[PDB]
């Protein structure tokens, strides 16, 4: 709908005091325009719209670049799988559009872009590959080899991509055990207790549980060509049906760790004279 | 006619004459779970009258140096009688709060405080190493911490301090601290009034929680704008924290939890 | 991976140098590890020589320099001031056993897998 | 702050033996970069475990790695001669350092 529109307003001399206000008390001044100067009749059309939290979440974003290699495996040691555990928190768009707010409860749509490259193409030519994607689930075993037994995929997820195809999308729902994501959690997975040693107790500020979505494995399923070729797949995230419930003020220094912390990339603000527009 | 209040929970009792108003978070009254929302199936226990009363913190004192004070709940509340036994011997618990603060001065005085109630008010650390700030210094119950006016880095990897270090203008978790008027919050300011009263629900991602690991509360008290009287040498006012849990249940009984302290 | 001398001097400094091939100095890491006699391994650095980029232990930090060269494709490490607790055996690894694991979600760890023959100092008079 | 692991272990052959290495958090019990070391009078060190329950190739198929917690342990299962020597543990600090341990000496009885 609309916005309200602007009643027109003449000049007052009244008890009524629209202008003093006390933010001692912790409120906003609910100020319109005819409350101050005079006003003309305005039919307002502009809308709200492109302003909510579901357009404010509607663009994907990068949040991982996951690397692999095809090559032979008795020269050199190269990557042909690797794991990689699911957060937000290590690329900062994505994580400052989150920790505007406290909590959090949307479905994801994941996107992955494949792209790949010749090392040196002197040494011959390679077909067209095929990726595959597994979840990992927290307790799943993990793969030790491109060529393990976890590769089977019987109760995992796994998503086949071949190289040139459109990029590959899957969607999950709401999959965290609260009743919303916590993006801060003020607290410890441990309490230490008293005659216990200095070992035992011991627990991180605020990572909750250690392993809170799994990983993603990925390899290359054909098997070795004379060339080396490296690929990286780019895992893009995109929040939707999105609910958010404490606003918080947004993050102002440069991201340290996963936590709150910060070493460097303080004084923010520049220099500004008072009296200079 | 506004500016006089009278709270009475328990058998406690404030009386204010100079007060603002009182701030209800997020337009919430503190309530018990309901049936449609209640996770655990063994009955809560719901002490009323035992616990819903108003404790009074440790008394702070205001002056020209200070940069500000901050504490946890439900752990500023953990030694306060039969509210911090029951926390001690059940599993989970739910309560919401009305925070009471307490700072009266002359009309001579000038200042302003700022009363921050921040949901998950995570601090930063000392060091290097993230997430490293231990349980003992993260909990240090009535007396709280206090912020600081610059960022130290801790050298000592022998024996490392495992400390917070929070910066007041960063808010102790690097956001401006112009921006923290968007959290629940009043203004003290000696001119107008001397009290403050926030009333705070239960927040979180939960219907309950444990309240030994977690803290669903921050208050934070800093100095908007600092203290001065009379072109003296020195001038040194209090502060005075008086907080009660409001519709307290915990379900899960078993033996005491002593938590180690160091 | 190859390690240049065997030197003693008490006080004064004592540089260091090891030597790699072209394709592992461009691409891979390379740590510097000390080993007193029965005392076990001791981490002291990094040096990446893709980026000139340099981390050192806290043990280490005021009195250890590391420094690059690419047209020999050698590494230096300097230690400014040496005492008699620093009479060890010191190693060249170069890291180039990769893990699974991504390191963030845009990089790759290495672990050590090709050492070096090693480096004696003897700090006494 | 070096990583926790027992002096000396002890065993005849054809027996199974385990060497424990305890850290911290930020540590073992935080990351996956838990790797094992093998080092024989005079040699430089070689790598046995790589990640967690990984070899490298080349490793003899009796050595097994695990993590619970806070703790790595290595598995030697038929325990041999050619086995005797030290064995030092490794992992990853979330500050960027990277830090051994202690060192056990293994001797066949």
């Known amino acids: 709908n609309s916005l309200p529109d602007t009643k027109p307003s003449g000049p007052a001399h009244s008890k009524e005091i629209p202008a003093l206000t006390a933010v001692e008390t912790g409120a906003t001044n609910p100020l319109v325009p005819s409350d101050t100067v005079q006003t003309r009749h305005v039919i307002q059309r502009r809308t709200r719209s492109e302003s909510t939290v579901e357009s404010f979440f509607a663009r994907g974003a990068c949040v991982a670049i996951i690397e692999v290699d095809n090559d032979a495996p008795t020269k050199r040691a190269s990557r042909l799988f690797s794991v990689w555990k699911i957060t937000y928190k290590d690329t900062v768009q994505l994580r400052r559009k989150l920790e505007f707010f406290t909590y959090s409860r949307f479905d994801m749509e994941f996107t992955f872009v494949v792209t790949s490259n010749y090392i040196d193409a002197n040494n011959g030519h390679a077909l067209n590959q095929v990726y595959q994607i597994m979840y990992i689930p927290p307790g799943a075993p993990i793969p030790g080899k491109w060529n393990d037994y976890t590769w089977q995929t019987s109760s995992n997820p796994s998503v086949f991509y071949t190289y040139g195809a459109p990029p590959a999308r899957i969607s999950v729902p709401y999959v965290g055990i609260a009743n919303a994501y916590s993006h801060f959690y003020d607290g410890f997975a441990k309490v230490p207790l008293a005659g216990q040693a200095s070992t035992e107790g011991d627990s991180l500020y605020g990572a909750a549980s250690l392993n809170d979505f799994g990983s993603l494995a990925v390899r290359v399923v054909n098997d070795h060509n004379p060339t080396r070729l490296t690929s990286k797949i780019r895992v893009y995230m995109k929040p939707k049906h999105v609910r958010v419930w404490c606003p918080r003020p947004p993050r102002a220094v440069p991201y340290f760790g996963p936590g709150v912390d910060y070493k460097d990339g303080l004084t923010p603000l520049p220099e500004k004279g008072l009296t200079t527009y | 006619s506004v500016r006089v209040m009278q709270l009475t929970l328990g058998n406690s009792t404030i009386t204010t004459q100079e007060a603002a108003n009182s701030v209800v978070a997020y337009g919430r009254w503190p309530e018990y779970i309901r049936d449609t929302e209640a996770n655990p199936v063994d009955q809560p226990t719901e002490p009323d009258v035992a616990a819903c009363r108003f404790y009074t913190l440790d008394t702070v004192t205001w002056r020209k140096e200070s940069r500000g004070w901050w504490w946890k709940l439900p752990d500023a509340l953990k030694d306060m009688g039969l509210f911090g036994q029951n926390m001690f011997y059940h599993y989970l618990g739910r309560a919401g709060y009305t925070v009471h603060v307490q700072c009266n001065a002359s009309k001579f005085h000038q200042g302003a405080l700022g009363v921050f109630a921040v949901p998950e008010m995570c601090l930063a650390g000392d060091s290097t190493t993230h997430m490293f700030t231990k349980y003992e210094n993260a909990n240090p119950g009535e007396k709280g911490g206090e912020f600081k006016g610059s960022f130290t880095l801790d050298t000592n990897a022998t024996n490392p301090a495992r400390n917070f270090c929070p910066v007041d203008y960063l808010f102790g978790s690097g956001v401006l601290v112009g921006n923290a008027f968007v959290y629940p919050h009043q203004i003290i300011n000696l001119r107008t009034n001397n009290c403050a009263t926030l009333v705070l629900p239960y927040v979180n991602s939960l219907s309950i929680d444990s309240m030994t690991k977690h803290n669903n509360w921050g208050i934070a008290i800093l100095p908007l704008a600092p203290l001065d009287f009379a072109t003296e040498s020195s001038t040194e006012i209090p502060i005075t924290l008086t907080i009660a849990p409001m519709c307290c249940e915990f379900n899960g009984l078993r033996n005491i939890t002593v938590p180690r302290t160091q | 991976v190859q390690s240049g001398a065997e030197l003693k001097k008490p006080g004064a400094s004592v540089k260091f140098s090891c030597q790699a091939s072209?394709?592992?100095?461009?691409?891979?890491?390379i740590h510097w590890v000390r080993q007193a006699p029965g005392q076990g391994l001791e981490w002291m650095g990094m040096?990446?020589?893709?980026?000139?980029?340099?981390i050192y232990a806290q043990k280490f930090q005021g009195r250890v320099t590391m420094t690059s060269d690419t047209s020999t494709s050698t590494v230096y490490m300097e230690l400014t001031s040496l005492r008699s607790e620093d009479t060890a055996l010191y190693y060249c690894?170069?890291?180039?056993?990769?893990?699974?694991?991504?390191?963030?979600?845009?990089?790759?760890?290495?672990?050590?897998?090709?050492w070096g023959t090693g480096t004696t100092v003897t700090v006494s008079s | 702050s070096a990583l926790t692991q027992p002096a000396s272990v002890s065993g005849s052959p054809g027996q199974s033996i385990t060497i424990s290495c305890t850290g911290t958090?930020?540590?073992?019990?935080?990351?996956?970069?838990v790797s094992w070391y093998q080092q024989h009078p005079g040699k430089a060190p070689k790598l046995i475990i790589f990640?967690?329950?990984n070899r490298p190739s080349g490793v003899s198929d009796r050595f097994s790695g695990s993590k619970s917690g806070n703790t790595a342990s290595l598995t030697i299962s038929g325990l041999q001669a050619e086995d005797e020597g030290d064995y030092y543990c490794?992992?990853?600090?979330?500050?960027?350092?990277?830090?051994f341990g202690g060192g056990t000496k293994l001797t066949v009885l």
């Open positions: 690894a170069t890291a180039s056993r990769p893990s699974a694991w991504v390191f963030r979600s845009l990089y790759t760890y290495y672990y050590m897998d090709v």
């Open positions: 072209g394709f592992t100095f461009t691409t891979y890491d």
């Open positions: 040096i990446s020589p893709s980026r000139d980029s340099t």
């Open positions: 958090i930020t540590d073992i019990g935080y990351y996956n970069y």
């Open positions: 990640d967690v329950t």
């Open positions: 490794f992992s990853h600090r979330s500050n960027n350092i990277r830090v």
